[PDB]
Amino acid sequence: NSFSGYLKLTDNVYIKNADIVEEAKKVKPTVVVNAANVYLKHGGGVAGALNKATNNAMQVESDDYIATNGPLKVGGSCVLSGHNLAKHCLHVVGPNVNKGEDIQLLKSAYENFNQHEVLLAPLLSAGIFGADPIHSLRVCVDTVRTNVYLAVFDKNLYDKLVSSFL
Ligand SMILES: O=C(O)[C@@H]1CCC[C@@H]1c1ccc2cnccc2c1
Numbered sequence: 017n018s019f020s021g022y023l024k025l026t027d028n029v030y031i032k033n034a035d036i037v038e039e040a041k042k043v044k045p046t047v048v049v050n051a052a053n054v055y056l057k058h059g060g061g062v063a064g065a066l067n068k069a070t071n072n073a074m075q076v077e078s079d080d081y082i083a084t085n086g087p088l089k090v091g092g093s094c095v096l097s098g099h100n101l102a103k104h105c106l107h108v109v110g111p112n113v114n115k116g117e118d119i120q121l122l123k124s125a126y127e128n129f130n131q132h133e134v135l136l137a138p139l140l141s142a143g144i145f146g147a148d149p150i151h152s153l154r155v156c157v158d159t160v161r162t163n164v165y166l167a168v169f170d171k172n173l174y175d176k177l178v179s180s181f182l
Pocket residue numbers: 035036037061062065138139140141142143144149167168169170173
């Protein structure tokens with residue numbers, strides 16, 4: 017495949033210090049993962065950045081999805097368009113520790129990735145979702161079996177994740 021510059025962590029997990037918006041524009045992957053909430057309100061973090069890169073088209077599509085189907089479950093996902101970034105966007109809801117949600121749902125959230133052979137993704141529940149990114153990477157490695165290319169925006173966090181990886 018065309019992903020370049022990644023550190024191989026395991027047989028199927030790869031990681032890079034990169035802005036997932038810029039990576040998606042360069043690679044045009046089959047699937048880019050959004051760190052969504054149950055309402056698909058793409059305000060900040062990964063979701064706000066991906067949505068802004070689509071000129072708000074992701075939000076317009078998402079509002080129609082919710083009007084038809086109602087909210088997602090914490091730990092659940094839906095497949096929508098990837099717009100100008102990817103063929104598809106897999107919107108995955110990891111638990112938000114800053115809203116008091118159960119971190120055990122993080123494994124269920126990563127299981128959605130197994131429905132796709134290859135994905136470009138952020139660490140679920142990390143960043144503004146409040147979980148420990150080292151824990152998120154561990155759950156990713158121990159749950160996802162398909163090929164996942166993780167983009168970590170912050171260089172300092174990337175270096176901490178590599179240097180602490182078991
Ligand atoms: O990758 C990271 O550094 C952390 C870990 C979970 C996602 C979070 C993050 C932070 C800033 C971001 C800016 N722009 C886009 C995506 C972004 C994602």
